[PDB]
Design a protein around this nucleic acid. Structure first.
Ligand SMILES: [Zn+2]
Length: 134
RNA sequence: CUGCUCCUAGCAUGCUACUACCGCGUAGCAUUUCCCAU
C-alpha cells in the first residue's frame, strides 16, 4: 500500500495522508461487495444515511426521521479521538464478518473464510511503502 | 477511495406536434368515350 501526502485546506497544521491500494484488491473487493453497497446506498429512511443528499429537502427528512416518538427528547453527540489510528483489530475483524453475513448461498464456508483472510491480509495489517522503504 | 451536486457536449431512444408528397380506403360531385369483319 503506497503512502502519499494530501494537498488541501484545513484549520490546523497537522498533515494529512491518503493511501494508494493495489489493483487486484480493488477488482476482488468490488466483485465481492458491490451489490450490498449499492443496496445500502439506495435505501432511504434507515439508521445509516450514506447516499442521501442534503438538497431538495433531504436534510429536513432526515432530521424528522431521527425525531421519532421520544417522550423527553434531547440531542447528544460525541467524538472519537483518532478513530482510524487506534481502532482495535478485533472490532475490524467482526465488522468485516457482519458484512459477509449476507453471503449465505453465494459462497461456502471455506470460501468465506478465505475471503476474510484475504481482506485481513490486504487492508487490515500489511506492508506500507512509505518514503522509499517498506 | 466512496457518496452528493452543478454545467457542458455528444449520442441514442421514446413520445408529441407541424409541413410536404404519395398511394390506399371511403364518400360526394361531375365528365369523357362510345365497338363493327375472320
Ligand atoms: Zn460470495
Amino acid at each position: 500500500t503506497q503512502m502519499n501526502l494530501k494537498y488541501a485546506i484545513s484549520a490546523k497544521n497537522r498533515a494529512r495522508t491518503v493511501a494508494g491500494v493495489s489493483i487486484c484488491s480493488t477488482m476482488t473487493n468490488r466483485q465481492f461487495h458491490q451489490k450490498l453497497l449499492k443496496s445500502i446506498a439506495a435505501t432511504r429512511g434507515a439508521t445509516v444515511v450514506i447516499g442521501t443528499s442534503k438538497f431538495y429537502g433531504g436534510w429536513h427528512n432526515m432530521l424528522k426521521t431521527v425525531y421519532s416518538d421520544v417522550e423527553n427528547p434531547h440531542l447528544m453527540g460525541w467524538d472519537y479521538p483518532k478513530c482510524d489510528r487506534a481502532m482495535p483489530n478485533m472490532l475490524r475483524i467482526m465488522a468485516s464478518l457482519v458484512l459477509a453475513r449476507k453471503h449465505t448461498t453465494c459462497c461456502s464456508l471455506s470460501h468465506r473464510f478465505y475471503r476474510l483472510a484475504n481482506e485481513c491480509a490486504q487492508v487490515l495489517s500489511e506492508m506500507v511503502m512509505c518514503g522509499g522503504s517498506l
